[PDB]
CSV table of C-alpha atoms and ligand atoms in Angstrom, one decimal:
chain,number,residue,atom,x,y,z
A,1,UNK,CA,-17.3,-33.6,6.0
A,2,UNK,CA,-17.5,-30.0,7.1
A,3,UNK,CA,-15.9,-26.8,5.9
A,4,UNK,CA,-12.3,-26.4,7.1
A,5,UNK,CA,-11.5,-23.9,9.7
A,6,UNK,CA,-8.5,-21.7,10.2
A,7,UNK,CA,-7.6,-20.3,13.8
A,8,UNK,CA,-11.2,-20.8,14.9
A,9,UNK,CA,-13.3,-19.5,12.0
A,10,UNK,CA,-15.2,-20.9,8.9
A,11,UNK,CA,-13.1,-20.8,5.7
A,12,UNK,CA,-15.7,-22.0,3.0
A,13,UNK,CA,-13.7,-22.2,-0.1
A,14,UNK,CA,-14.1,-25.9,-1.1
A,15,UNK,CA,-14.2,-27.7,-3.0
A,16,UNK,CA,-12.1,-25.8,-5.5
A,17,UNK,CA,-9.7,-24.6,-2.8
A,18,UNK,CA,-8.5,-27.2,0.1
A,19,UNK,CA,-6.0,-27.9,2.6
A,20,UNK,CA,-6.0,-24.4,4.3
A,21,UNK,CA,-3.2,-23.1,6.2
A,22,UNK,CA,-2.9,-19.9,8.5
A,23,UNK,CA,-0.7,-16.9,6.9
A,24,UNK,CA,-1.9,-14.1,8.9
A,25,UNK,CA,-4.3,-11.1,9.5
A,26,UNK,CA,-4.5,-7.6,9.0
A,27,UNK,CA,-7.1,-5.0,10.7
A,28,UNK,CA,-9.7,-6.3,8.3
A,29,UNK,CA,-9.0,-9.6,6.7
A,30,UNK,CA,-7.5,-13.1,7.7
A,31,UNK,CA,-5.2,-14.6,5.0
A,32,UNK,CA,-4.6,-18.3,4.6
A,33,UNK,CA,-2.8,-20.4,1.8
A,34,UNK,CA,-4.8,-23.1,0.0
A,35,UNK,CA,-4.4,-25.7,-2.9
A,36,UNK,CA,-6.4,-24.5,-5.9
A,37,UNK,CA,-7.3,-27.7,-7.4
A,38,UNK,CA,-8.3,-26.2,-10.7
A,39,UNK,CA,-5.0,-24.6,-11.4
A,40,UNK,CA,-2.9,-27.1,-9.4
A,41,UNK,CA,-1.0,-24.7,-7.4
A,42,UNK,CA,-1.2,-23.0,-4.1
A,43,UNK,CA,-2.6,-19.6,-3.6
A,44,UNK,CA,-3.6,-16.9,-1.0
A,45,UNK,CA,-7.1,-16.3,0.2
A,46,UNK,CA,-8.2,-13.3,2.1
A,47,UNK,CA,-11.4,-13.5,4.2
A,48,UNK,CA,-13.4,-10.4,4.8
A,49,UNK,CA,-16.8,-10.1,6.7
A,50,UNK,CA,-17.6,-6.4,6.0
A,51,UNK,CA,-21.3,-6.0,5.5
A,52,UNK,CA,-22.2,-4.7,9.0
A,53,UNK,CA,-20.0,-1.8,8.4
A,54,UNK,CA,-20.3,1.0,5.9
A,55,UNK,CA,-16.5,1.7,6.0
A,56,UNK,CA,-15.7,-2.3,5.7
A,57,UNK,CA,-17.7,-2.4,2.5
A,58,UNK,CA,-16.0,0.8,1.2
A,59,UNK,CA,-12.5,-1.1,1.4
A,60,UNK,CA,-13.9,-4.4,0.1
A,61,UNK,CA,-15.4,-2.5,-3.2
A,62,UNK,CA,-12.4,-0.4,-3.7
A,63,UNK,CA,-9.7,-3.2,-3.7
A,64,UNK,CA,-11.7,-5.4,-5.7
A,65,UNK,CA,-12.8,-3.0,-8.3
A,66,UNK,CA,-9.1,-1.6,-8.9
A,67,UNK,CA,-7.2,-5.0,-8.5
A,68,UNK,CA,-9.4,-6.6,-11.0
A,69,UNK,CA,-8.6,-4.0,-13.5
A,70,UNK,CA,-4.8,-3.8,-12.8
A,71,UNK,CA,-2.3,-5.7,-14.3
A,72,UNK,CA,1.3,-5.3,-13.5
A,73,UNK,CA,4.3,-7.6,-12.4
A,74,UNK,CA,4.9,-5.4,-9.1
A,75,UNK,CA,1.1,-5.5,-8.1
A,76,UNK,CA,-0.7,-8.3,-6.7
A,77,UNK,CA,-3.7,-9.9,-9.0
A,78,UNK,CA,-7.0,-11.3,-8.1
A,79,UNK,CA,-7.4,-14.5,-9.6
A,80,UNK,CA,-10.8,-15.5,-8.2
A,81,UNK,CA,-13.6,-14.4,-5.7
A,82,UNK,CA,-15.9,-16.7,-3.8
A,83,UNK,CA,-19.2,-15.8,-2.2
A,84,UNK,CA,-22.6,-17.0,-1.7
A,85,UNK,CA,-25.0,-17.6,-4.6
A,86,UNK,CA,-27.6,-15.1,-3.2
A,87,UNK,CA,-27.2,-11.6,-1.8
A,88,UNK,CA,-29.0,-12.5,1.2
A,89,UNK,CA,-26.6,-15.5,2.0
A,90,UNK,CA,-23.7,-13.5,1.2
A,91,UNK,CA,-21.9,-12.9,4.5
A,92,UNK,CA,-18.2,-13.2,3.8
A,93,UNK,CA,-16.1,-12.7,0.7
A,94,UNK,CA,-13.2,-14.6,-0.1
A,95,UNK,CA,-10.4,-13.0,-2.5
A,96,UNK,CA,-7.9,-15.3,-4.2
A,97,UNK,CA,-4.5,-14.1,-5.1
A,98,UNK,CA,-1.0,-15.3,-6.2
A,99,UNK,CA,0.5,-16.8,-3.1
A,100,UNK,CA,3.4,-14.9,-2.0
A,101,UNK,CA,6.1,-15.9,0.9
A,102,UNK,CA,6.4,-12.9,3.3
A,103,UNK,CA,6.2,-9.1,3.5
A,104,UNK,CA,8.5,-6.5,4.3
A,105,UNK,CA,7.3,-5.8,7.6
A,106,UNK,CA,8.3,-9.4,8.9
A,107,UNK,CA,11.5,-9.4,7.0
A,108,UNK,CA,12.6,-6.3,8.3
A,109,UNK,CA,11.6,-7.3,11.9
A,110,UNK,CA,14.6,-9.8,12.1
A,111,UNK,CA,16.5,-9.6,8.9
A,112,UNK,CA,19.3,-7.6,7.4
A,113,UNK,CA,19.2,-6.2,3.9
A,114,UNK,CA,22.3,-5.6,1.8
A,115,UNK,CA,22.5,-2.4,-0.1
A,116,UNK,CA,21.7,-4.3,-3.3
A,117,UNK,CA,18.5,-5.9,-1.9
A,118,UNK,CA,17.3,-2.5,-0.6
A,119,UNK,CA,18.1,-1.0,-4.2
A,120,UNK,CA,16.1,-3.7,-5.8
A,121,UNK,CA,13.2,-3.5,-3.7
A,122,UNK,CA,13.2,0.4,-3.9
A,123,UNK,CA,13.1,-0.1,-7.6
A,124,UNK,CA,10.3,-2.7,-7.6
A,125,UNK,CA,8.2,-0.4,-5.3
A,126,UNK,CA,8.4,2.5,-7.4
A,127,UNK,CA,8.1,0.6,-10.8
A,128,UNK,CA,4.7,-0.8,-9.3
A,129,UNK,CA,3.8,3.1,-8.1
A,130,UNK,CA,4.6,4.2,-11.7
A,131,UNK,CA,1.7,2.2,-12.9
A,132,UNK,CA,-0.6,2.9,-10.1
A,133,UNK,CA,-0.1,6.6,-10.4
A,134,UNK,CA,-0.3,6.5,-14.3
A,135,UNK,CA,-3.7,5.1,-13.7
A,136,UNK,CA,-4.6,8.3,-11.9
A,137,UNK,CA,-4.8,6.3,-8.6
A,138,UNK,CA,-3.7,7.0,-5.2
A,139,UNK,CA,-2.6,3.8,-2.8
A,140,UNK,CA,-2.8,6.0,0.2
A,141,UNK,CA,-1.5,3.3,2.6
A,142,UNK,CA,1.8,1.9,1.7
A,143,UNK,CA,3.5,0.3,4.3
A,144,UNK,CA,6.2,-2.4,5.0
A,145,UNK,CA,3.2,-5.0,5.6
A,146,UNK,CA,1.7,-4.5,2.4
A,147,UNK,CA,4.6,-5.0,0.4
A,148,UNK,CA,4.7,-8.7,-0.4
A,149,UNK,CA,7.9,-10.7,-1.4
A,150,UNK,CA,8.3,-14.3,-2.8
A,151,UNK,CA,11.4,-16.4,-2.4
A,152,UNK,CA,12.8,-15.0,-5.6
A,153,UNK,CA,12.7,-11.6,-4.2
A,154,UNK,CA,9.8,-10.3,-6.5
A,155,UNK,CA,8.0,-7.7,-4.7
A,156,UNK,CA,4.4,-6.8,-5.3
A,157,UNK,CA,2.0,-4.3,-3.6
A,158,UNK,CA,-1.1,-5.4,-2.2
A,159,UNK,CA,-3.8,-4.2,0.2
A,160,UNK,CA,-5.7,-1.5,-1.8
A,161,UNK,CA,-8.7,-1.1,0.6
A,162,UNK,CA,-8.1,2.6,0.8
A,163,UNK,CA,-6.9,3.3,-2.8
A,164,UNK,CA,-8.8,6.2,-4.6
A,165,UNK,CA,-8.7,7.6,-7.9
A,166,UNK,CA,-6.7,10.9,-7.5
A,167,UNK,CA,-9.8,13.0,-8.2
A,168,UNK,CA,-7.4,16.2,-7.6
A,169,UNK,CA,-10.3,17.2,-5.3
A,170,UNK,CA,-12.9,15.0,-3.7
A,171,UNK,CA,-13.3,15.5,-0.1
A,172,UNK,CA,-12.6,12.1,1.8
A,173,UNK,CA,-14.0,12.6,5.3
A,174,UNK,CA,-13.8,10.2,8.2
A,175,UNK,CA,-10.5,8.7,6.6
A,176,UNK,CA,-8.4,10.1,9.5
A,177,UNK,CA,-10.4,8.9,12.4
A,178,UNK,CA,-11.0,5.4,10.8
A,179,UNK,CA,-8.8,2.6,12.6
A,180,UNK,CA,-5.8,1.4,10.7
A,181,UNK,CA,-3.0,-0.8,12.2
A,182,UNK,CA,-0.4,1.8,11.7
A,183,UNK,CA,-0.1,5.7,10.7
A,184,UNK,CA,4.0,5.9,10.7
A,185,UNK,CA,3.9,6.0,6.9
A,186,UNK,CA,1.5,9.0,6.2
A,187,UNK,CA,2.5,12.2,4.9
A,188,UNK,CA,2.3,15.1,7.1
A,189,UNK,CA,-0.4,16.8,5.0
A,190,UNK,CA,-2.7,14.0,5.3
A,191,UNK,CA,-2.1,13.7,9.1
A,192,UNK,CA,-3.3,17.2,9.4
A,193,UNK,CA,-6.3,16.7,7.0
A,194,UNK,CA,-5.5,18.9,4.3
A,195,UNK,CA,-8.1,18.3,1.4
A,196,UNK,CA,-6.6,18.4,-2.1
A,197,UNK,CA,-3.4,16.2,-1.3
A,198,UNK,CA,-2.0,14.5,-4.3
A,199,UNK,CA,0.2,11.4,-5.6
A,200,UNK,CA,2.9,12.9,-3.5
A,201,UNK,CA,1.6,11.4,-0.4
A,202,UNK,CA,2.4,7.7,-1.7
A,203,UNK,CA,6.2,9.3,-2.4
A,204,UNK,CA,6.4,10.2,1.3
A,205,UNK,CA,5.3,6.7,2.2
A,206,UNK,CA,7.8,5.1,0.1
A,207,UNK,CA,10.5,7.4,1.6
A,208,UNK,CA,9.5,6.1,5.1
A,209,UNK,CA,9.8,2.7,3.8
A,210,UNK,CA,13.3,3.1,2.4
A,211,UNK,CA,14.4,4.7,5.6
A,212,UNK,CA,13.3,1.7,7.5
A,213,UNK,CA,15.1,-0.8,4.9
A,214,UNK,CA,18.3,1.1,6.0
A,215,UNK,CA,18.1,0.7,9.8
A,216,UNK,CA,15.4,-2.0,10.3
A,217,UNK,CA,13.6,0.7,12.4
A,218,UNK,CA,10.5,3.1,11.6
A,219,UNK,CA,11.8,6.5,11.1
A,220,UNK,CA,8.7,8.6,12.3
A,221,UNK,CA,7.1,6.4,14.9
A,222,UNK,CA,4.6,8.0,17.5
A,223,UNK,CA,1.4,7.4,19.6
A,224,UNK,CA,-0.4,9.8,17.6
A,225,UNK,CA,-0.2,12.5,14.7
A,226,UNK,CA,0.9,15.0,17.1
A,227,UNK,CA,3.6,13.0,18.4
A,228,UNK,CA,4.5,11.7,14.9
A,229,UNK,CA,4.7,15.5,13.7
A,230,UNK,CA,7.3,16.1,16.7
A,231,UNK,CA,9.6,13.1,15.3
A,232,UNK,CA,9.1,14.5,11.6
A,233,UNK,CA,10.0,17.9,12.5
A,234,UNK,CA,12.8,16.7,14.8
A,235,UNK,CA,14.6,15.4,11.8
A,236,UNK,CA,13.5,17.3,8.7
A,237,UNK,CA,13.8,20.6,11.2
A,238,UNK,CA,11.1,23.3,11.3
A,239,UNK,CA,8.8,23.9,8.4
A,240,UNK,CA,8.4,27.4,6.6
A,241,UNK,CA,5.2,29.3,6.1
A,242,UNK,CA,5.5,28.1,2.3
A,243,UNK,CA,5.8,24.6,3.4
A,244,UNK,CA,2.6,24.7,5.2
A,245,UNK,CA,0.9,25.8,2.0
A,246,UNK,CA,-0.8,22.4,2.2
A,247,UNK,CA,-1.6,22.6,5.8
A,248,UNK,CA,-5.1,24.2,5.8
A,249,UNK,CA,-6.6,24.1,9.2
A,250,UNK,CA,-6.1,27.5,10.8
A,251,UNK,CA,-5.0,26.1,14.4
A,252,UNK,CA,-2.9,23.4,13.0
A,253,UNK,CA,-1.0,25.8,11.0
A,254,UNK,CA,-0.5,28.3,13.7
A,255,UNK,CA,0.3,25.2,16.0
A,256,UNK,CA,3.1,24.0,14.0
A,257,UNK,CA,4.6,27.5,13.2
A,258,UNK,CA,4.5,28.2,16.9
A,259,UNK,CA,6.7,25.2,17.8
A,260,UNK,CA,10.4,25.6,18.9
A,261,UNK,CA,12.8,25.9,16.1
A,262,UNK,CA,14.3,22.7,14.8
A,263,UNK,CA,17.5,22.1,13.1
A,264,UNK,CA,17.8,19.6,10.1
A,265,UNK,CA,19.6,16.3,10.9
A,266,UNK,CA,21.7,15.3,8.5
A,267,UNK,CA,20.7,12.0,6.8
A,268,UNK,CA,24.3,10.4,7.0
A,269,UNK,CA,24.3,11.1,10.9
A,270,UNK,CA,21.0,8.9,11.4
A,271,UNK,CA,22.4,6.4,8.4
A,272,UNK,CA,26.0,6.4,9.0
A,273,UNK,CA,26.6,3.3,6.8
A,274,UNK,CA,24.2,3.9,3.9
A,275,UNK,CA,24.7,4.5,0.2
A,276,UNK,CA,25.3,8.2,-0.1
A,277,UNK,CA,23.0,8.0,-3.4
A,278,UNK,CA,20.3,6.3,-1.4
A,279,UNK,CA,20.3,9.2,1.5
A,280,UNK,CA,20.1,11.7,-1.7
A,281,UNK,CA,17.1,10.0,-3.0
A,282,UNK,CA,15.5,9.6,0.5
A,283,UNK,CA,16.2,13.2,1.1
A,284,UNK,CA,14.2,14.2,-2.0
A,285,UNK,CA,11.1,11.8,-1.0
A,286,UNK,CA,11.1,12.9,2.4
A,287,UNK,CA,10.4,16.7,1.8
A,288,UNK,CA,7.7,18.4,4.2
A,289,UNK,CA,6.4,20.4,1.1
A,290,UNK,CA,4.2,18.1,-1.1
A,291,UNK,CA,4.8,20.0,-4.1
A,292,UNK,CA,8.6,19.8,-3.7
A,293,UNK,CA,8.7,16.1,-3.4
A,294,UNK,CA,10.2,14.0,-6.5
A,295,UNK,CA,7.6,12.2,-8.5
A,296,UNK,CA,7.8,8.7,-9.3
A,297,UNK,CA,9.2,9.0,-12.8
A,298,UNK,CA,12.1,11.0,-11.9
A,299,UNK,CA,12.6,9.0,-8.7
A,300,UNK,CA,13.1,6.0,-11.0
A,301,UNK,CA,15.7,7.9,-12.9
A,302,UNK,CA,17.6,8.7,-9.8
A,303,UNK,CA,21.3,7.5,-10.0
A,304,UNK,CA,20.6,5.2,-7.1
A,305,UNK,CA,18.4,3.0,-9.2
A,306,UNK,CA,20.2,3.4,-12.6
A,307,UNK,CA,21.2,-0.4,-12.6
A,308,UNK,CA,17.7,-1.3,-12.8
A,309,UNK,CA,16.3,1.7,-14.7
A,310,UNK,CA,14.5,1.1,-18.1
A,311,UNK,CA,11.5,3.0,-19.1
A,312,UNK,CA,11.1,0.3,-22.1
A,313,UNK,CA,10.1,-2.0,-19.4
A,314,UNK,CA,8.3,0.1,-16.8
A,315,UNK,CA,4.8,-0.2,-18.3
A,316,UNK,CA,1.9,2.2,-17.5
A,317,UNK,CA,-1.9,2.1,-17.6
A,318,UNK,CA,-3.1,2.7,-21.1
A,319,UNK,CA,-5.6,5.1,-19.6
A,320,UNK,CA,-6.3,6.9,-16.5
A,321,UNK,CA,-8.8,5.4,-14.2
A,322,UNK,CA,-12.4,7.0,-13.4
A,323,UNK,CA,-14.2,5.2,-10.9
A,324,UNK,CA,-17.9,4.2,-11.6
A,325,UNK,CA,-19.7,6.3,-9.1
A,326,UNK,CA,-19.1,7.9,-5.6
A,327,UNK,CA,-18.9,5.1,-3.2
A,328,UNK,CA,-18.3,7.4,-0.1
A,329,UNK,CA,-22.1,8.4,0.1
A,330,UNK,CA,-23.7,5.2,0.0
A,331,UNK,CA,-25.6,3.0,2.4
A,332,UNK,CA,-24.1,-0.3,3.3
A,333,UNK,CA,-26.8,-2.1,1.5
A,334,UNK,CA,-26.0,-0.3,-1.7
A,335,UNK,CA,-22.5,-1.2,-1.3
A,336,UNK,CA,-23.2,-4.8,-0.8
A,337,UNK,CA,-25.1,-4.9,-3.9
A,338,UNK,CA,-22.4,-3.4,-5.8
A,339,UNK,CA,-20.1,-5.8,-4.4
A,340,UNK,CA,-22.3,-8.7,-5.2
A,341,UNK,CA,-22.5,-7.4,-8.9
A,342,UNK,CA,-18.8,-6.9,-9.0
A,343,UNK,CA,-18.1,-10.5,-7.9
A,344,UNK,CA,-20.9,-12.0,-10.1
A,345,UNK,CA,-18.7,-13.1,-12.9
A,346,UNK,CA,-16.7,-15.5,-10.8
A,347,UNK,CA,-19.9,-17.6,-9.9
A,348,UNK,CA,-19.8,-21.1,-11.0
A,349,UNK,CA,-22.4,-20.6,-13.9
A,350,UNK,CA,-22.2,-17.1,-15.0
B,1,UNK,CA,16.7,-14.4,0.0
B,2,UNK,CA,19.1,-15.3,-2.6
B,3,UNK,CA,21.3,-13.1,-4.6
B,4,UNK,CA,18.8,-11.2,-6.6
B,5,UNK,CA,20.4,-13.1,-9.4
B,6,UNK,CA,17.6,-15.5,-9.5
B,7,UNK,CA,14.8,-12.9,-9.6
B,8,UNK,CA,13.1,-12.5,-13.1
B,9,UNK,CA,13.2,-8.8,-13.4
B,10,UNK,CA,16.9,-8.4,-12.2
B,11,UNK,CA,17.6,-10.9,-14.7
B,12,UNK,CA,16.0,-8.8,-17.4
B,13,UNK,CA,18.1,-6.0,-16.5
B,14,UNK,CA,21.2,-8.2,-16.6
B,15,UNK,CA,21.0,-7.6,-20.3
C,1,ANP,N1,-1.4,-12.7,-1.6
C,1,ANP,C1,-0.6,-12.8,-0.4
C,1,ANP,N2,0.2,-13.6,-0.4
C,1,ANP,C2,1.0,-13.9,1.0
C,1,ANP,N3,0.6,-13.1,1.9
C,1,ANP,C3,-0.4,-12.2,1.9
C,1,ANP,C4,-1.0,-12.1,0.8
C,1,ANP,N4,-2.1,-11.0,1.0
C,1,ANP,C5,-1.8,-10.5,2.3
C,1,ANP,N5,-0.8,-11.3,2.8
C,1,ANP,C6,-0.6,-11.2,4.3
C,1,ANP,O1,-1.7,-10.9,5.2
C,1,ANP,C7,-1.6,-9.7,5.7
C,1,ANP,C8,-2.8,-9.0,5.5
C,1,ANP,O2,-3.1,-8.7,4.2
C,1,ANP,P1,-4.0,-7.3,4.0
C,1,ANP,O3,-4.3,-7.4,2.4
C,1,ANP,O4,-3.2,-6.1,4.4
C,1,ANP,O5,-5.3,-7.5,4.8
C,1,ANP,P2,-6.2,-6.2,5.6
C,1,ANP,O6,-6.5,-6.6,7.1
C,1,ANP,O7,-7.5,-6.2,4.6
C,1,ANP,N6,-5.5,-4.7,5.1
C,1,ANP,P3,-4.6,-4.0,6.3
C,1,ANP,O8,-5.2,-4.1,7.8
C,1,ANP,O9,-4.1,-2.6,6.1
C,1,ANP,O10,-3.3,-5.0,6.5
C,1,ANP,C9,-0.3,-9.0,4.8
C,1,ANP,O11,0.4,-8.0,5.7
C,1,ANP,C10,0.5,-10.1,4.4
C,1,ANP,O12,1.4,-10.4,5.4
């Protein structure tokens, strides 16, 4: 009797889902593994309790809307969603997904990867991203901890709470001052708050992830965005005025152009034992100027990935996504209503 | 983390 508890808090997913086991937490959800008694298989279930904060509601609605509409081998699916039968009773949302074994953050924390693993993982990240971007969506928060792996080295991108249609404009305010667990994978233009950034921000993130697979260390850590820029410039060298084309804040632009000159550090000096083709691709992803970054299609065609490259089996969305309304200018009560309606179809009865 | 040989995608590319 009673609903199961995990590390101290209720997990009300029975009777369909039973035998809960803790997996971990992010900044926003707690994730457990569970036995699905309908499909007779173990699954993952992320609990979120977002309805007291506008931004939590935002993350929840975005991830639900986008993932329910994506279908790709290298992107996590949503199998089911549990929440109370009435909007008033609804305080928590349970997102059920395919169960994965680990993520790239934990793996890299202690485990060495061969050049072949690195190559295969990078390929899968990019195959996933090709689909995301083809749907005219930006992930915006790619990092090792939301690259899931199973035991057969299958990789799946998750954690779409910050994903947005690449509405080539749109002003997403608050995004930069909002809490996240790590900012180490963010492109320099987004850290500097340049409205009008593009798909290239994701490519930058992937570049940071590749660097980390090569060395088991983050390439641009830092206590904050200014310190992070100091790491970035220390390796890529000083930017030109043309590089700062996408840096729109006046003082930030002048600050950057005022700094002491920095020479580029060759990639093979930092990564002395890496495949030289990996370093060439890395060099093309981690370019300061967003418009000169290699895009995802050309990246998949890079000589480093030629052994897995196959455009006959790298599927895209049949049509670009177009978000229903605008979620950033909605009260949390409305966002809750939209979440209720978006999850209605999984209710026992519907 | 086996040889990627057991991964289905890598297996599809092994053709
Ligand atoms: N389907 C899954 N299978 C196995 N592990 C998962 C799964 N989904 C999430 N996890 C793990 O739980 C952690 C957090 O999930 P995540 O989706 O990032 O939740 P979050 O707090 O909403 N987002 P974030 O704060 O950016 O990490 C991940 O880093 C994974 O380690």
